Design an enzyme around this catalytic site. Structure first.
Site, PDB file in Angstrom:
ATOM      1  N   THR I   1       0.838  -1.191   0.000  1.00  0.00           N
ATOM      2  CA  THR I   1       0.000   0.000   0.000  1.00  0.00           C
ATOM      3  C   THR I   1       0.879   1.249   0.000  1.00  0.00           C
ATOM      4  O   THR I   1       0.656   2.181  -0.773  1.00  0.00           O
ATOM      5  CB  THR I   1      -0.952   0.024   1.217  1.00  0.00           C
ATOM      6  OG1 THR I   1      -1.775  -1.147   1.202  1.00  0.00           O
ATOM      7  CG2 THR I   1      -1.847   1.255   1.187  1.00  0.00           C
ATOM      8  N   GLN I   2       1.896   1.252   0.864  1.00  0.00           N
ATOM      9  CA  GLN I   2       2.797   2.393   0.962  1.00  0.00           C
ATOM     10  C   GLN I   2       4.052   2.236   0.113  1.00  0.00           C
ATOM     11  O   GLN I   2       4.682   3.242  -0.225  1.00  0.00           O
ATOM     12  CB  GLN I   2       3.194   2.635   2.425  1.00  0.00           C
ATOM     13  CG  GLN I   2       4.055   1.539   3.056  1.00  0.00           C
ATOM     14  CD  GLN I   2       3.231   0.418   3.659  1.00  0.00           C
ATOM     15  OE1 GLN I   2       2.035   0.314   3.409  1.00  0.00           O
ATOM     16  NE2 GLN I   2       3.872  -0.433   4.449  1.00  0.00           N
ATOM     17  N   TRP I 107      -0.756  -9.076   4.616  1.00  0.00           N
ATOM     18  CA  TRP I 107      -1.139  -8.892   3.230  1.00  0.00           C
ATOM     19  C   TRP I 107      -1.008 -10.145   2.386  1.00  0.00           C
ATOM     20  O   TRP I 107      -1.475 -10.146   1.244  1.00  0.00           O
ATOM     21  CB  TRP I 107      -0.316  -7.760   2.605  1.00  0.00           C
ATOM     22  CG  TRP I 107      -0.706  -6.425   3.136  1.00  0.00           C
ATOM     23  CD1 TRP I 107      -1.790  -6.141   3.903  1.00  0.00           C
ATOM     24  CD2 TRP I 107      -0.002  -5.193   2.970  1.00  0.00           C
ATOM     25  NE1 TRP I 107      -1.824  -4.807   4.206  1.00  0.00           N
ATOM     26  CE2 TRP I 107      -0.731  -4.203   3.650  1.00  0.00           C
ATOM     27  CE3 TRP I 107       1.173  -4.831   2.314  1.00  0.00           C
ATOM     28  CZ2 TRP I 107      -0.327  -2.877   3.687  1.00  0.00           C
ATOM     29  CZ3 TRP I 107       1.571  -3.514   2.347  1.00  0.00           C
ATOM     30  CH2 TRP I 107       0.826  -2.555   3.032  1.00  0.00           C
TER      31      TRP I 107
END
Lengths: 234, 232, 202, 234, 233, 233, 213, 230, 216
Positions: I1-2, I107
């Protein structure tokens, strides 16, 4: 361990508090500093430690402590504890200002300090604050007033009460409750201290005013050499 | 009354709550551990009270990190407690540093744990001597033994328990250095049957080249082979 | 920012470029992204600059305290393991793609990669940094097997010369460090020592 | 007796001086007996009626989903310990979604009742559990103790004068690992029927038993359901 | 001295077997479970006659269908009566039903043997609750009363006496109850209070009686009902 | 009351725990004497194995704080490793917190200060081991220090520690007023003149630091054997 | 940045007769456009007389059945009495509400029968609002099955048909036809409904297939 | 962990039993003199070790509090070192908030404030170190002494440690209000010379002055210099 | 995500008469860059259970040290009682649902399988906590691509021998080599049977590029 604790917060079988009335006998060993109010302002009258030359200068003494513009306090008993608590109560005074923008009418302050000092004798297992300190002050509500407290916790308006050794009974045959005329209150103060004397071995301090704001004077040196020759007989 | 608190010395410097814990493992059965070049062999005496207890009613050969062992002596509650926090300690080492825990660091760690637990009046000392033991592929057959005082020494043939006054003599006369652990598993029974002077239903575990850094209750065949060291 | 580290035989050979760009301005023309952490184990540092050396002296603290606690020289797998933990637990705040190397006495040449997400793999050659995408073809094609110290020295030298030639955020002198049994033998390549390659002219 | 401020202290021989005295405090409790077969383990308890009449302070307890217990000592402390054992047994139902094995159950309560034996001013859990359950292998049965030292036993009796029940039950171990439910619980009740003060009957009121094992839930037999178990004359 | 979490050379705790005392001190209460209700009574021992006797609360209704009857060290129960009613309306809140009597009695008796010197935050208890009580209540199982101890031990009871009259009144109650209510267990229980009499012939000023019947919820008896019963004896 | 029980002031001062903790460091007694050379702080101690069943390599005192500071302690060996681990902790914490590697003096100030807070607060005993610890900084010569279990580090030339401390410091005082990198007539001869064993190279542990090589080195029977056969003058 | 919910689909139905409660189900859990499995039940046997249906996000449905199962067991030997049905509905209302601010995105239906024996069925929003009914399917084909058994069970907007009470033959044939209709018309069909049906003597569980696409 | 009950308590006479024992442990300490002088002070003390074996440049007894305030003790050894640690920390709180070197009076306020709660507050015994303070603070020098009770007094001269009655009487005899520089050092040296237990070695005394340029220890070549000028 | 996390692509598996076989490619793709080639994504645990990973690989190293530490820890209690693949599946489910319940989620999206006492097992555990059991599983784009070849043969016969299942997942892995962009050539195939867990890596895919020269 429970073998080691002094158990300060225990009632006696006679109902009293052992560590509290041991503080009351700590006052009788070291303690002076009566206080007289008048229709005019209020004064403390105090004694230093001994004759021992070896003492350069006190800004204020170890006895009279300033608290606001309109209050002061004097201290008996153990001097190590009370210093702490007077800075403690000084904090209380200023934060009342921060909460109210008032100069803290002194009964609020005495009530607060007596509540926290009662809290040290209530729980925590610690020793109580061994000092029966007293207070002088003024508010716009009441007149000039002095309060007096002790390590137990209670307090009162104690119009001419002294603390420490050689206990005030002569004052409750001499104080005129209606009018007092603060110069003659100085005369009665050096009478009582003359029975129990320049500013090497005395510490007298007055609270007066001019045009509304209060003035706390510590009665610098030569005024004491005035009043000490204001006798012949007494 | 300079007794009864671990934070108070004697007038000649001897913390009595430690030496009272030391005799508190001297009134419990033996557990010998013998080092040799291919690993460390443990053997624990059992003092089976009734017939009601089954085989392995109380484990006294615990293991910790899939290779170090726990021959314990004293109170089984306290020994079981420091056994499981030794499990958590090698858990934090393997999780933390990745590398499998070398035994010297575990013995120093559990050693300073049970020592730092004897500095306070708010705790009692442990009442359990115990010993460790393993080998990595390049470690050597490391074993250590830890007192309730918290001191940890590297040994060869240390023995803790009630009859350690007897047990240290035979381990000293046994040839220590150069034999290949299978015989000494057999020879452990000779020590245990000598020091038991009264059901002695003993129990053995080791780590060795037959194990490759593990622990097994024996596998189970020397229990009917080292039982044949009766009449000695 | 481009880092190489090749396990040759026995020991390893490191290599790092030297720029510290504030986007489009070289704030430090001469920095050592090579840094020692114990004696033989070196960690490199890529990506960001402020976080990764807080990690580097944090693991100099933990690895040094652990190594003096064991009274033994620690493995490179130890340092890369607490790089996996120390970089993994703070993974959303750190841009530290460090790749480390060193000679433990037990195993030998070890080069681990701790990339930006934070993990640990063992590689023969490792590579990591900003410009370390322009030379996967050359390093993938030239590195054969089991090379020696001088040809991994010039192999890391001209691989980093390609990557400093083509990246804009990578340049300056390059620093080599060959960890072996007899300690680090590091040097720099000052200008003409860079193996300059010819440009085709159109 | 300066060893009265005393789960921190050691008697000078080896003795910890009150968590063996908690073992006295479960010798004082009511008698019970559990045992195991090759297939299913049983629990049998007599319930004291120190009142008008009662449910006689119901002893054997439902903890589980086949890991049942039998308390014998303090009752409120027993209920605290089985809310612990109960809650984390259900926690192992929640997380792992398997039956929690009996050995890890009794070991971690053996580490839970071990903490107040260690630290200061905290009494041990003065209750002797006699837990019994059927995990993957044979139906285990564990005495544990207030000294936090459990025992992987078979056929154990604890409580008031339960030693005579043990010495019946020690010399009748040969007909275990056989002896199905109908003839097993008779063999446990005639083991319980020696702790009684030598006057004749295991009544349906005071005897409450529990059955656990292969293909059956830990099942409590109360006042009514113990009446099909009837035999013996001595 | 010694602490609170220590075992006694008799076999039990110090503070628990000392908490069995200060139950002989204090007033006496009795309760009878019947087949159609449960009656509770207590002679609340008024000291002076200068005063108001109808505010000595010794019959306290936990819920509409659970009423307790404490004795011993009075007003030490108010924290666990508070826990009884807060737990009661928590049960009705989260489960939308009535309760048993062993769930309130299960919940209160967990707080009995839960104290200690050095433990969590100082809102915990030091001494055990020196108040023995019994929850007269009606359930969907049946009317029943659960006699507690200060030890956390609670038992099923159908005829139980507490207070100073825990021997003579209990032995008298042992021989006079077998059958059912039929309106006269409440009149053969104040008769036991009539034998107990300490200061006054048990008029409608010094005894408090309340029954819990399955038709109604409870009934704390007022004065004319009481002296209606006392006139019949 | 509790003058000889708690670390508090007795009458006439003299808190009766630190000298009860000083008598704890004489328990058993494996005895260190430290020699300082205008260029080499050698370390000596005696170490006795009981029964040839201990591993003689594992038993030692002679710990290594860092790459420049060694230490040796003669107290009760239970309290030794709890003290040396905190010294390693504050050494590595100094190097992480203030850059450079910690110099030898304020390390001993700091462990002297936590030993002070042992003997200032109650509910903890002042642990009985004293830390003879050596080391070289860049500015001055080699140093040696000893914090006692009261926290009074001094800065020594040549004290000793353990049983027979007074005979050792008397011998060193009589043999330092004469004026020694070799330290052959000083280091071992303090032991062999105090307790008269004239050691074989097993029982003696020696830890040197030199200005030419500041790494702390524990010596083996080869070089200490040449050091002992050098006592043939 | 993460989107902690998906919609794994599934439609579950329960009907309250006079001595029964047909808790229907479906099988196919699926998100996006690919199906995962065709075995998965959605009616869970809580007690012998209470069956939940549970549709929506499947992981939170699963954890919710673990919580209500383990707290049913936490009730049952804290009072020595099994749960009723309305008390299950109440405590599941406060479990669904208790985590409101990150809610249980799950549409669950509790069938079963009352204390006296008559069947009841409690419906829920994903934050907790129970009403007893005699119908109300829920969760994916909520707005598809509802108007049929608004008519063929409730008899609303319908004149004098002389409506009879339901039974285990008329309502049995009323569950299979609505799920083959929703098998035609919904996308989140199900291939084999597993009707956990509750009765006075106990519980059985009929299964029959559907449109498998 | 911890006790949270005070071991210092009131006698049945009405006095603190631990504090008079603390003044006993001070009175059994090494003697130390301190002389307030018309421009600056001198705080001498006596460092007699066991043998001639130790490093007399290793530990100090004159040591400053960070700007111009030194403090010398008499009594317990390491409790002093704790009070130096706390005193330096309090002076640096004051310096980081008010951006001047601390007035000596306020430092004695805060050091006497931290020595008070060790007469209370959970098992701790009081320090038993009555250290004395110096300081130039603007215009005229200051001098104080924080007793292990927590009191403090300012004067012109004092002594402490062993036989301090002779120090107070002797300084009461030989003091002048203008007596200002090195003459104070002179009488300080002949106050320690009064007993000393023998021979007046320069390595066994150390002095510290506050000569309007910060407190500074005196180098051992300067004390022996005036020991040559006796 | 980052950040561009280091991922895998697919762990596809099928159960069979006998045991269960799962397969995955060794790839450390750093967001369209095959940064890590020789990287094993097949965890061995105790001798009757296996474990894969499709998403983030760093979280798979976190899970291999907590699964590894848990299974050795309960492995060394003696008394038998190893984890059935019930409990690894359920513990991993509660770990991930209790991990996204605090919005700090794992994740990776794995499949764990294993042969229990009676029969085999093949369970899916999702990034969000969506956990179930299935006769045949695939993760990531394999769930779009390998999944039709798996739930075609298993709808015809739900009984497979070991060679049929092994060739089946070899063929599906070849299909993911053809179509999935984040896929690499060599792959570990890994089977647990009555005799235990065994991992046969690495293998290759016989590619069929014979349709390439018909493009104009």
């Amino acid at each position: 361990s429970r073998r080691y604790d002094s158990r300060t917060t225990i009632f006696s079988p006679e109902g009293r508090l052992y560590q509290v009335e041991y503080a009351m006998e700590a006052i009788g060993h070291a303690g002076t500093c009566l206080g007289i109010l008048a229709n005019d302002g209020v004064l403390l009258a105090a004694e230093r430690r001994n004759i021992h030359k070896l003492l350069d200068e006190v800004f204020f003494s170890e006895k009279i402590y300033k608290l606001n513009e309109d209050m002061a306090c004097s201290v008996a008993g153990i001097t190590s504890d009370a210093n702490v608590l007077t800075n403690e109560l000084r904090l209380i005074a200023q934060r009342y200002l921060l909460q109210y923008q008032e100069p803290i009418p002194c009964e609020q302050l005495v009530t607060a300090l007596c509540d926290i000092k009662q809290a040290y004798t209530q729980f925590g297992g610690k020793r109580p604050f061994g000092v029966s300190l007293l207070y002088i002050g003024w508010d716009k509500h009441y007149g000039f007033q002095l309060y007096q407290s002790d390590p137990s916790g209670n307090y009162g308006g104690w119009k001419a009460t002294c603390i420490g050794n050689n206990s005030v009974s002569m004052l409750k045959q001499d104080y005129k409750e209606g009018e007092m005329t603060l110069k003659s209150a100085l005369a009665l103060a050096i009478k009582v201290l003359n029975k129990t004397l320049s500013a090497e071995k005395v510490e007298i301090a007055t609270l007066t005013r001019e045009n509304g704001k209060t003035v706390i004077r510590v009665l610098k040196q030569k005024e004491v050499e005035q009043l000490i020759k204001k006798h012949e007989e007494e | 009354g300079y007794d009864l608190s671990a934070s108070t010395f004697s007038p000649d410097g001897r913390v009595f709550q430690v030496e009272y814990a030391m005799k508190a493992v001297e009134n419990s059965s033996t557990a010998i551990g013998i080092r040799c070049k291919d690993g460390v062999v443990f053997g624990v005496e059992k003092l089976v009270l009734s017939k009601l207890y089954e085989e392995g009613s109380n484990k006294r050969l615990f293991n910790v990190d899939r290779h170090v062992g726990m021959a314990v002596a004293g109170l089984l509650a306290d020994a079981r407690s420091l056994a499981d926090i030794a499990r958590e300690e090698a858990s934090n080492f393997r999780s933390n540093f990745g590398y499998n825990i070398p035994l010297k660091h575990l013995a120093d760690r559990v050693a300073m744990y049970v020592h730092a637990y004897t500095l306070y009046s708010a705790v009692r000392p442990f009442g359990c001597s115990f010993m460790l033991g393993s080998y990595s592929v390049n470690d050597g057959a490391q074993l250590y033994m830890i007192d309730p005082s918290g001191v940890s020494y590297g040994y060869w043939g240390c023995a803790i328990g009630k009859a350690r006054q007897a047990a240290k003599t035979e381990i000293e006369k046994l040839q220590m250095k150069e034999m290949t652990c299978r015989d000494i598993v057999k020879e452990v029974a000779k020590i245990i049957y000598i020091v038991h002077d009264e059901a002695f239903e003993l129990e053995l575990s080791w780590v060795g080249e037959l194990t490759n850094g593990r622990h097994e209750i024996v596998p189970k065949d020397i229990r009917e082979e080292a039982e044949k060291y009766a009449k000695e | 920012t481009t880092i190489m580290a090749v396990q040759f035989d026995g020991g390893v050979v490191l290599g790092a470029d030297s720029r510290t760009t504030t986007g489009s301005y070289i704030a430090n023309r001469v920095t050592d992204k090579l840094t020692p952490i114990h004696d033989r184990i070196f960690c490199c540092r890529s990506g960001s600059a402020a976080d990764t050396q807080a990690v580097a002296d944090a693991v100099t603290y933990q690895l040094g305290f652990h190594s003096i606690e064991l009274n033994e020289p620690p493995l490179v797998h130890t340092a890369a393991s607490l790089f996996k933990e120390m970089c993994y637990r703070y993974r959303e705040d750190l841009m530290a793609g460090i790749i480390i190397a060193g000679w433990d006495p037990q195993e030998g040449g070890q080069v681990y990669s701790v990339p930006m997400g934070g993990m640990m793999v063992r590689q023969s050659f490792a590579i990591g940094g900003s410009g370390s995408s322009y030379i996967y073809g050359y390093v993938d094609a030239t590195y054969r097997e089991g090379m020696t110290k001088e040809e991994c020295l010039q192999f890391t030298a001209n691989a980093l010369a390609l990557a400093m030639e083509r990246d804009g955020s990578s340049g300056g002198v390059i620093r080599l460090a060959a960890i072996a049994e007899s300690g680090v033998e590091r040097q720099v390549l000052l200008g003409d020592q860079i193996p300059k390659f010819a440009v085709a002219t159109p | 007796n300066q060893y009265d401020n005393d789960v921190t202290v050691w008697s000078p021989q080896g003795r910890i001086h009150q968590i063996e005295y908690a073992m006295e405090a479960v010798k004082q409790g009511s008698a019970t007996v559990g045992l195991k077969s090759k297939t299913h383990a049983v629990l049998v308890a007599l319930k004291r009626a120190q009142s008008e009449l009662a449910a006689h302070q119901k002893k054997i307890l439902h903890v589980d989903n086949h890991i049942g217990i039998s308390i014998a000592g303090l009752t409120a402390d027993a209920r605290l310990l089985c809310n612990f054992m109960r809650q984390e047994c259900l926690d192992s139902r929640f997380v792992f979604d398997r039956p929690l094995p009996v050995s890890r159950l009794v070991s971690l309560i053996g580490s839970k009742t071990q903490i107040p034996t260690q630290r200061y001013g905290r009494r041990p859990y003065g209750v002797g559990l006699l837990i019994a359950g059927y995990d993957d292998m044979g139906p285990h049965i564990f005495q544990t103790c207030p000294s936090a030292n459990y025992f992987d036993c078979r056929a154990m009796s604890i409580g008031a004068r339960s030693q005579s029940a043990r010495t019946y039950l020690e010399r009748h171990m040969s007909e275990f690992m056989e002896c199905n439910l109908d003839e097993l619980v008779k063999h446990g009740l005639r083991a319980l029927r020696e702790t009684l003060p030598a006057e004749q009957d295991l009544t349906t009121k005071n005897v409450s038993i529990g059955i656990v094992g292969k293909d059956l839930e830990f099942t409590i037999y109360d006042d009514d359901d113990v009446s099909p178990f009837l035999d013996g004359l001595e | 001295d010694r602490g609170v979490n220590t075992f006694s050379p008799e076999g039990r705790l110090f503070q628990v077997e000392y908490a069995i005392e200060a139950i002989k001190l204090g007033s006496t209460a009795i309760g009878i479970q019947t087949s159609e209700g449960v009656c509770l009574a207590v002679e609340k021992r008024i000291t002076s006659p200068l005063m108001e006797p109808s505010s000595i609360e010794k019959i306290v209704e936990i819920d509409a269908h659970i009423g307790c009857a404490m004795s011993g060290l009075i007003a030490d129960a108010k924290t666990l009566i508070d826990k009884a009613r807060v737990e009661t309306q928590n049960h009705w809140f989260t489960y939308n039903e009535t309760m048993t009597v062993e769930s309130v009695t299960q919940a209160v008796s967990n707080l009995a043997l839960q104290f200690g010197e050095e433990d969590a935050d100082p809102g915990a208890m030091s001494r055990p609750f020196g108040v023995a009580l019994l929850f007269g209540g009606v359930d969907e199982k049946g009317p029943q009363l659960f006699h507690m101890d200060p030890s956390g031990t609670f038992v099923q009871c159908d005829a139980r006496a507490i207070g100073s009259a825990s021997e003579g009144a209990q032995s008298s109650l042992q021989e006079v109850y077998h059958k059912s209510m039929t309106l006269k267990e409440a009149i053969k229980s104040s008769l036991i209070i009539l034998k107990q009499v300490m200061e006054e012939k048990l008029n409608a000023t010094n005894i408090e009686l309340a029954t819990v019947q399955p038709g109604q919820n409870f009934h704390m008896f007022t004065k004319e009902e009481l002296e209606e019963v006392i006139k019949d004896i | 009351g509790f003058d000889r029980h708690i670390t508090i002031f007795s009458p006439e001062g003299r808190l009766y725990q630190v000298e009860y903790a000083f008598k704890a460091i004489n328990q058993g007694g494996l005895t260190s004497v430290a020699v300082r050379g205008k260029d080499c702080a050698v370390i000596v101690t005696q170490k006795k194995v009981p029964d040839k069943l201990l591993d003689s390599s594992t038993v030692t005192h002679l710990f290594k704080i860092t790459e420049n500071i060694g230490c040796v302690m003669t107290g009760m060996t239970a309290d030794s490793r709890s003290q040396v681990q905190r010294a390693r902790y504050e050494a590595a914490n100094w190097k992480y917190k203030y850059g450079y590697e910690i110099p030898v003096d304020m390390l001993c100030k700091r462990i002297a200060d936590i030993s002070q807070v042992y003997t200032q607060n109650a509910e903890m005993r002042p642990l009985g081991c004293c830390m003879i610890l050596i080391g070289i900084d860049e500015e001055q010569g080699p140093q040696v220090y000893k914090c006692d279990p009261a926290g009074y580090y001094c800065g020594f030339k040549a004290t000793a520690a353990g049983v027979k401390q007074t005979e050792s410091t008397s011998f060193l005082e009589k043999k330092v007023k004469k004026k020694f990198e070799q330290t052959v007539e000083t280091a071992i001869t303090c032991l062999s003149t105090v307790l008269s064993i004239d050691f074989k190279p097993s029982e003696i542990e020696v830890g040197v630091v030199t200005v030419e090589n500041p790494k702390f080195r524990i010596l083996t029977e080869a070089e200490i054997d040449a050091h002992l056969v050098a006592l043939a003058e | 940045r993460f989107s902690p919910y998906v919609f794994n689909g599934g439609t579950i139905l329960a009907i309250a007769g006079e001595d029964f409660a047909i808790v229907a189900s479906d099988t196919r859990l699926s998100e996006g456009f690919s199906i995962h499995t065709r075995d998965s039940p959605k009616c869970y046997k809580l007690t012998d007389k209470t069956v939940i249906g549970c549709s929506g996000f499947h992981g939170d449905c699963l954890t919710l059945t673990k919580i209500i199962e383990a707290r049913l067991k936490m009730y049952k030997h804290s009072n020595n009495k099994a749960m009723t049905t309305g008390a299950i509905a109440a405590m599941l209302s406060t479990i669904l509400y208790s985590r409101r601010f990150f809610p249980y995105y799950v549409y669950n239906i509790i069938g079963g029968l009352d204390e006296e024996g008559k069947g009841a069925v409690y419906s829920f929003d994903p934050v907790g609002s129970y009403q007893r009914d005699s119908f109300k399917a829920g969760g994916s084909a909520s707005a598809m099955l509802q108007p049929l058994l608004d008519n063929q069970v409730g008899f609303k907007n319908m004149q004098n048909v002389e409506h009879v009470p339901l039974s285990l033959d008329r309502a049995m044939r009323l569950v299979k036809d609505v799920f083959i209709s929703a098998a035609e018309r919904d996308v989140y069909t199900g291939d084999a409904l597993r009707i956990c049906i509750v009765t006075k003597e106990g519980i059985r569980e009929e299964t029959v297939s559907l449109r498998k696409d | 962990r911890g006790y949270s009950f005070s071991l210092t308590t009131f006698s049945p006479s009405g006095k603190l039993v631990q504090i008079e024992y603390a003044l006993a442990a001070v009175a059994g300490g090494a003697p130390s003199v301190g002389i307030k002088a018309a421009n600056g002070v001198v705080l001498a003390t006596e460092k007699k070790q066991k043998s001639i074996l130790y490093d007399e440049r290793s530990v100090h007894k004159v040591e400053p509090i960070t700007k111009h305030i030194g403090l010398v003790y008499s009594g317990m050894g390491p409790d002093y070192r704790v009070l130096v640690h706390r005193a330096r920390k309090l002076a640096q709180q004051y310096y980081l908030v008010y951006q001047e070197p601390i007035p000596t009076a306020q430092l004695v306020q805060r050091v006497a404030s931290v020595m008070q709660e060790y007469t209370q507050s959970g098992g701790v015994r009081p320090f038993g170190v009555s250290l004395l303070i110096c300081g130039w603070n603007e215009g005229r020098p200051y001098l104080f002494q924080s007793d292990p009770s927590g009191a403090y007094f300012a004067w012109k001269a004092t002594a402490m440690g062993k036989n301090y009655v002779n120090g107070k009487t002797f300084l009461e005899k030989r003091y002048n209000e203008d007596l200002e520089l090195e003459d104070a050092i002179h009488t300080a040296i002949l106050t320690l010379k009064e007993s000393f237990e023998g021979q007046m070695t320069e390595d066994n005394i150390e002095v510290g002055i506050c000569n309007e340029a910060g407190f500074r220890r005196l180098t051992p070549t300067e004390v022996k210099d005036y020991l040559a000028a006796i | 995500t980052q950040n561009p996390m280091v991922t895998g692509t697919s762990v596809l598996g099928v159960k069979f008469e006998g045991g269960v076989v799962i397969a995955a490619d060794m790839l450390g793709s750093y967001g369209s860059l095959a940064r890590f080639r020789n990287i094993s994504r097949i965890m061995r645990v105790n001798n009757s259970t296996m474990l894969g990973a499709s998403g983030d690989y760093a979280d798979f190293q976190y899970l291999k040290q907590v699964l590894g530490q848990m299974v050795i820890d309960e492995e060394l209690l003696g008394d038998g009682h190893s984890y059935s693949p019930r409990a690894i599946h359920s513990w991993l489910t509660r770990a991930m649902y209790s991990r996204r319940s605090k919005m700090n989620p794992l994740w990776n999206t794995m499949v764990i399988g294993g042969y229990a006492d009676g029969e085999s097992f093949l369970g899916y555990v999702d990034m969000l906590g969506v956990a179930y059991e299935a006769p045949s599983l695939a993760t990531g784009y394999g769930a779009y691509l390998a999944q039709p070849l798996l739930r075609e043969v298993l709808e015809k016969q739900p009984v497979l021998s070991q060679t049929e299942a092994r060739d089946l997942v070899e063929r599906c892995m070849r299909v993911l080599y053809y179509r999935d962009a984040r896929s690499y050539n060599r792959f570990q195939i890994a089977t647990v049977t009555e005799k235990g867990v065994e991992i046969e890596g690495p293998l290759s895919t016989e590619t069929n590029w014979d349709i390439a020269h018909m493009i104009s």
